[PDB]
Structures are given as structure tokens and as C-alpha cells.
């Protein structure tokens, strides 16, 4: 058991080294055991056999404007336009093989397209460059998702600065829980 809260409409950054327990803690939240509906973005991409569009809207009704916004915010506009079939391009059937970064951006676009109570984004920028990551973190996680309940797994000080609350884990246990100001008074 970890002492932390999930505040409505706020960004909670979950920080820590490899093996700190970050993915396990997301699983405890989804599994309803922590802290004391869900839109999940896994740290390794996930794609289903189907189109780029089918993978993002993921069984829910298509909304042109909501789709347009998400695609722009996840830096998917340029990628999609370069395909002859564009949005209808078929993935996972032996045909087109996307890059780890493209797959990561689709995974994130699927998570933000979903109308959920809680957004769990497990290291969504791990297979992205530092410039693409900055554009997506600012335009998507911060702006597009401004009043959504988000849990972002990140150890970047640049992201922690923008979080409402931070949870630092160490070997399965909490080290720190609080604001960036509180974290700074330990430097």
C-alpha cells in the first residue's frame, strides 16, 4: 500500500527508476486496489489488426472534430497524410509496419480519443525523440487534456514542474508524494 490520492481533473506524475514499481502501481489502480472509466496507454505500443482510424476511435462512434484535434495533438497529421490510403491504412495483417514512435503516437491518440474518467499513460514518450515528446506533452497532456484526471508515468523534471502532484517511487515504496514546490525543498 502507497499513500497518495487521485484528484479529479489533475495531473499526477508517477516518477522513479527502472524497477521502482511504476507499471505495477498503474495495475493496482486499474485493479481497484489503489489508491483508497479507464483509458490506458501501455509503455510498449498496442495495435489491433485494422486501420489507423479503427485503432484510434477503438469501437466508439466517430466524431470528425474530436478525431482531428487528437491527431493534431499527438503529432499524427504528417504521418497519416504520407500514406496513400491515409487513415484507412491497414495495420497488423502482415502489410504495413509502422515505427515504434508511430505506434506509440497511435496508442496515445487511442487513449486520449476515449471518453474516460481516468487516463493512465505509462511512459508514452519512451520511444519518441525529445522534440516530439515536448510538442505532445504540451499540446496533448497539458492543453487538450487540461481538466481530465491524468496519471502520467514520467521522471522528467520538465514534466514534474507541470504536474499538480508528484509520486516518486523507490523499490515498490513511495519516497515522496506532493507538489513540485515541496519536491524542490529537497534538492
Amino acid at each position: 500500500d502507497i499513500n497518495f490520492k487521485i484528484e479529479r481533473g489533475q495531473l499526477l506524475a508517477v516518477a522513479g527508476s527502472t524497477g521502482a514499481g511504476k507499471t505495477s502501481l498503474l495495475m493496482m489502480i486499474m485493479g481497484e486496489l489503489e489508491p483508497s472509466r479507464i483509458s490506458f496507454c501501455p509503455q510498449f505500443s498496442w495495435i489491433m489488426p485494422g486501420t489507423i482510424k479503427e485503432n484510434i476511435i477503438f469501437g466508439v462512434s466517430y466524431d470528425e472534430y474530436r478525431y482531428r484535434s487528437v491527431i493534431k495533438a499527438c503529432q499524427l497529421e504528417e504521418d497519416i497524410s504520407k500514406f496513400p490510403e491515409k487513415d484507412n491504412t491497414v495495420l497488423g495483417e502482415g502489410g504495413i509496419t509502422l515505427s515504434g514512435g508511430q505506434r506509440a503516437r497511435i496508442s496515445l491518440a487511442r487513449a486520449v480519443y476515449k471518453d474516460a474518467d481516468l487516463y493512465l499513460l505509462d511512459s508514452p514518450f519512451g520511444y519518441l525523440d525529445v522534440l516530439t515528446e515536448k510538442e505532445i506533452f504540451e499540446s496533448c497532456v497539458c492543453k487538450l487534456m487540461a481538466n481530465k484526471t491524468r496519471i502520467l508515468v514520467t521522471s522528467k523534471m520538465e514534466h514534474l514542474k507541470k504536474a499538480d502532484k508528484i509520486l516518486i517511487l523507490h523499490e515498490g515504496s513511495s519516497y515522496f508524494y506532493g507538489t513540485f514546490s515541496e519536491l524542490q525543498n529537497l534538492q
Partner: nanobody
Amino acid sequence: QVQLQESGGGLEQPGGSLRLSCATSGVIFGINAMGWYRQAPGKQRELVATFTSGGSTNYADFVEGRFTISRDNAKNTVYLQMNGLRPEDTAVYYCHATVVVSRYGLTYDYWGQGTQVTVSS
């Protein structure tokens, strides 16, 4: 104070080769992602080649197998072997590192000053 220093830049002719190096100093913990970015005059900074946080390598579309990114974990250095240099490759090449600045794995992104790479006939 964490500091990154690029070297190896210079004037080359089309089809030429160059090797860019990036040394680091003041690294107390470790460096995770390291990589190479560039910006031509009046153009926006763009990726060349980088080590992702995952440990994989990600190259820009324009590289087309010409460039190779290497890393020395013991020295905390990053390299870019460039071949088949084109006039379009002319830019200020910047070094980047996601440096671990805490004992809890918290990081800060650091950039070098840049090195000029000029490809001209």
C-alpha cells in the same frame, strides 16, 4: 554542473564523411537517452538520430542508412558517424542527453552548444 561538448564538425564535400563526438562532464548518476539533432539557418530543430529511453535507436527519414549513432556508457559519450554527406545536411548539429540528476531516477534534458557541419561543392 552538467555540460555537453560537441566536436568533429567541419567543412566537407558532397559524398564526404564526418564523425561527431559529444563529451559530457559533471555527470553524478547516469545518462539515459542520448542523441543528435540539427537546425539549418531559418529552419526548425529536427531529430537526426537518437537513443530512445527504451534503449532502441530512432533515425530521421532523411538519414537513409547513411548515419550511425554509437554510445560509450563508461565515458558517457555519444557519436554520429556520417557518410554520403549531401548539401542538405548543412546545419548546426546539437547533442542531447537526458541526465539522471537524482538518486531516485529523476532527469533533466541537456543540450550542447552545437557544432557546424557544412557540406559544399
